[model samples]
Target chain A: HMKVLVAEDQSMLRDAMCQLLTLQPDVESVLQAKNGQEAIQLLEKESVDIAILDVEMPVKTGLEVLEWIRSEKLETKVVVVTTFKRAGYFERAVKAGVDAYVLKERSIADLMQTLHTVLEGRKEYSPELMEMVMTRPNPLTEQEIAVLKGIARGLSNQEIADQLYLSNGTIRNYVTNILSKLDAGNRTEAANIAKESGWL
Target chain B: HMKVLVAEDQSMLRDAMCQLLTLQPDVESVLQAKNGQEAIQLLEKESVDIAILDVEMPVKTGLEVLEWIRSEKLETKVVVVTTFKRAGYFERAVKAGVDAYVLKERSIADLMQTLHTVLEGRKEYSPELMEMVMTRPNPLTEQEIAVLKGIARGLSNQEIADQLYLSNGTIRNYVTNILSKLDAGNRTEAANIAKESGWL
Candidate 1:
């Protein structure tokens, strides 16, 4: 039996997901949060093995919550549940240590399977979404890609190093590579391209 | 005055376009193709200065015809006029040297301006198309776009080079990058997606 928390802004979707998870044989205790801030509060107070999160919410997005959890070094796995399957979002969430992703257009069995996979210390993504997220148009090395995303959010090289726990030189090297791949003349161009290319 | 060819499958749209173009003073003659095959036949038989093509058509796609013209060096400019404005398509078309691109939902004045600009040896794209082609969903690099178009044609690296005036090694590099960007396993899958996405 696994413990899970469902975070979504939409009321019907939140309740219905709770109901569905409770009915799952493997889900022993299911919790709910109306938004990201609430989900963070719930996480601080309660024990959850997996968190099912909606990417778009009023107070702090699902991605934000995922970042907070990772920053706190919590063991809870995150699975993004979204209506629109934008490739950029998929890439960012995965880099933030998201374990699985589920699009609303897919079947319930897919979601259940994802829940089980994450619970068992594994990562899984829908075949379709994987196709879009993993491929490179603006190909960045994993480190460079992560750094570029940080740069896109207006983070300085030192800040990126601090956040990812790397040296400033390493972050600078990543930025240089990012600029080369994107053919950007400067950091702003690189950041703009990264954001434009969906790496951010 | 330039000779223009209109390639569209739907009769109503085809006729409307023909009327619209013929009404313009700079258009000396307006030829119509019900499908891509017929359009190809027209290009082979006549001297077309400009081609207004719809992305979706039977026999072969408009993008295919565009590629053929480019390879043959027929000096015919292409304008991709489509109802759907998937960003991928716009990027590919522009990289393939399309002179202009327009969306049906956008203003006609914009389309006319694009046409006039293209006629004057300038590239043109509607504002919506410009934003999509530049802003949304990281644009695939020129090399990747080429590979995708080649893959869509069921061509191997060697064949793609022969058609596109590129080296085999360069073609291979493009394919490798395409696989990485599309997160597809093989050339076949990438090509299939590129075609279905109307990128080529």
Candidate 2:
């Protein structure tokens, strides 16, 4: 038995999802929220095993909620359900640590299957989305990518170090290594390649 | 009556599309090409009223074909049809001056409707695609965006000028205008914001 929360802005979609989730054999209860703020409030007050969130909402976006959940260190597994795979949302959601990412265009049965798999401690993302997100070769580690993003934004070594809580010397060394690996002549060239490769 | 060329890599899809287009009352002939290079060769030999190109093709991608067509200053109306909207492809196609764009998942009837609208000297793009491309607020002109992309890649004024075949003074003026419009302190910050905003 599991308690699942669904947070979507549309009334018809919200009700229909709740009805479908309630019919599932393993679902004990299906919680509903009309917007992201209400969803957060419900999560804070209730013990939810899983969360189904829409990316675009009234109060806060799904990515924002995902960040909050991770920041609060909540163990509730999250699945983002949305209609459109806009340019940056997929990449951002993946970085935010979602258990599953589904599209509304897909059948609800598919979404149900994803929920089951996620509950069993497996990760699932839409095949189409996985194709787009995985096609980009990400050779840099998360830390290196972070440092590169900062560098592209024209941040100084000291500024990046201050934000990342690292020594300036370490940041400089990371930049040098990044330039060599990317085969860039300088920080600007490295940042440019990263941007072109969709790494940043 | 119109002569149309369809460039698709798949044999079945190519034949099916040709059959469908031949059935159209306004279409007098439907030419077929298995790859981008073949499509370009066909275009060079024949005066085509419209071109339907698949984005993914062997030898040269549809985008490369489109660039070739535009460079030769061909007057044919182009509509790129593809299964998936890969990153940057849509933006590039639009930049290449496509008269219409469609997805393969759309019905043949819808494609026919688009062709009809386009032949009427009007533009038509799939609504879903239009939503994806138009939702982003891009105030910069095409030239400015091109310059900004080079800047983001850490190209110097001289390098960008040489590549664009423009004078150094013109490139410098464009950079100044870009900085003011983007409201950034320097080139790097401008590039970072552009990347973040999905403008580049």
Candidate 3:
């Protein structure tokens, strides 16, 4: 009695997923979208119980669609499936409020089970993916990341304060926090580490 | 008559690739490494004409291995075959001086052909992959990116100059260049764009 939408760019995988979902007894309807744009359009017109999205797609990305769905307050549950193991992408999905996040590295059976769990109103995430995402310890807050970015760009504390509309002392404290959190010897070292970790 | 190293974490895929390479006429020996550390150890012990690396591996990543090999000035040609379509990883491989870069999305035959071409002292990068890498236009030089990172971190021109041992005027000029190159409306817009694009 559940309708599912499969949005994947790869035609072969999309067809296979659609075929598999259609065979599930609980799945009343299985919709297909070749790209993110089509997936959004379908979601706009048709009511789906759940959406299985690929992180990378043509036109728009799965993350972007997820953001749109959440912003628009759609009732459909979302589950992301991607080949990427990058921490940045994984973090983005979790922040976007996905019901489940699965990797293509897992078996189709696992994906199916995750889909069912999501439909049951429970959250499911791959333990391995979560582990990878958590492996990189980032103590910097969003505001701190912004401050770090400013420092990386070679801006003085006063200049940063002028831009962020904060006092010079506050900017100095943020830099101190960034240095200690990253265990950097100095501002330059912190910048280097941020660049290396792809945080900057 | 040349030896090749296959560094992959998955046992099934690793074994299959090793078997396939051993059967090739040009390959006299096929070395197998279960992880990046093992790959580095094997390379240190035995000379390899080429190294076929999987991007995601334990201990270190394929891109890290490429960096280590290049730093040591090893003669082994590197061919990265990864499932990730992340532009950052691709840019890293190119920066690390890989002889050939292939994706797991391509057929095994295509990878084999690319390996052969690389062995012939020729480069064979997938045009599609290169196109994706080039599509994200980054005109900023290393110094500019560094300066931009400082600005993104909320640093002033004077602060950046003090840290980088440059004059305030020089830092101002760099910021001007960064703003125009990123096509940002102003310094703030440039910082926002840099953050959005993961450049900061």
Candidate 4:
């Protein structure tokens, strides 16, 4: 019997999931949380092996919970269960080292399979959802996109300024802003932000 | 009976959707488009009330079709069916003014509901997909984005130096920081990530 923690704000979905798990023979104690704060408290106090999390919960999202788990080096495994189809979520989940990533609308059978795989210490993803993860185009706006494209072609700030006919200060401002938003400390960091975020 | 056009490149899914549509008494015709070009041709010659489009089609993406539809000011309502759940897609889709955005993983029952709702001159968004739109996962700093934009334009440390009037070392530091945050291998990839993620 495995101890499971469920983090979700939606009452209906949370109740349904808890009810479903209670029926499972392998489940022992099922802890329920209304939000990330509650979930974090439970996680800190209790011994839990598995967590089912909703990405969009109030105060500390599921991803934030996962980050905490990772940072704290907890032994618990996490599975992200979300209704929305976010391309970045898939990538972030994998990078965060989640045990499984499940889409709500896929067949319950498939979800069960993922849960099983996760129980056995592995990773799982919905195929269709994975497709979205792989193919959703980068989300850069046109101006940012233009700036990213310009950087890729190896143009200088002044040259780029000449091309776009913007003030050199304006170009510098753009660069500074990009780095700041990316949380990067420098230019190369900005470049990396541009690439992995699918700007290039 | 409303004239409906289904643009799925996959014959299996298209056929399944058509079969499912037959059960709905209000649907008149479900013309299939294997590619964006086919979708364009149909719209050019015939009148369509609702167009169900697949983004990853052969020729033009679903976005392209919608752009053309909007550009020509056609009265046809577009329902985009995509496999991925990227915020970027939703952002663009909304800007293009699509009527209905459905994911493939959505239950057939829900899809039907969305279709009917769209046909009634109302917009539809899946409860799950709505989460991605409302809350974004990654956030970049303004300064980081600006620096990235400048870097993407091919600015040098010294040139970015003169433009931003920052010390060359300071510009270099920003580059490194951005790369780390974005998790890119280098500037080129970073640029791409920024552009695709819709960041500066």
Worst 10 residues of 1 chain A by lDDT: A127-136
RMSD of each: 17.6, 14.5, 16.2, 12.9
**Model 1 deviation from the true structure expressed as Cα RMSD, one decimal place:** 17.6
Candidate chain B TM-scores, in order: 0.66, 0.65, 0.65, 0.83
Model 1, span B1-200: residue lDDT tens: 88999999999888877887877889899999989999999999999988988889889888888988888999898888888766567656655777777788755455555576578664555544433333334346655676677677677889988888989998888788668767889888877766655456
Ten-residue region with minimum lDDT total, candidate 4 chain A: A130-139
Model 2 spans with C-alpha error above 4 angstroms = A138-198, B1-200
C-alpha DockQ of every model = 0.09, 0.02, 0.02, 0.03
**What local distance difference test score does each model get?**
0.75, 0.76, 0.76, 0.73
Of the pair 1 and 2, which is ahead by lDDT?
Answer: 2
Candidate with best TM-score: 4
Candidate 4: tens digits of C-alpha lDDT, residues B15-90: 8777888888987777888999999999998999888888889899998999899999999988888887765676
TM-score per prediction, in order, is: 0.45, 0.39, 0.43, 0.49
The segments of candidate 4 whose C-alpha lies over 4 angstroms from its true place after superposition are A1-200, B107-109, B125-134
lDDT tens digits, residues B64-133, model 3?
Answer: 8999999999999999876423433555666687776666666556667778767877555554443333
Q: How is the predicted docking of candidate 4 categorized under the CAPRI scheme?
A: incorrect
For residues A1-200, could you state the per-residue lDDT of candidate 4 as single tens digits? Answer: 77999998988988888888777887788999999888999999999989989875778878889988998999998988865333345555666777766686554455555566678764555434543543443444445555666787787788778888888888888878766655557665466446644445
Query: What lDDT tens digits, residue by residue, belong to model 1 across residues A116-165?
Result: 76776655554444334324455765467668778767898899999999
Candidate 1 collision pairs = A135-B180, A135-B181, A135-B183, A136-B180, A136-B181, A197-B138
Tens digits of per-residue lDDT, candidate 2, A1-200, equal: 79999998989878878888988988999888888888889989988999989887889877788888888888899999877755356656766778888887787777887787689765666655433433223435456778999999999999999999999998998788678667789999988876654466
TM-score of 1: 0.45
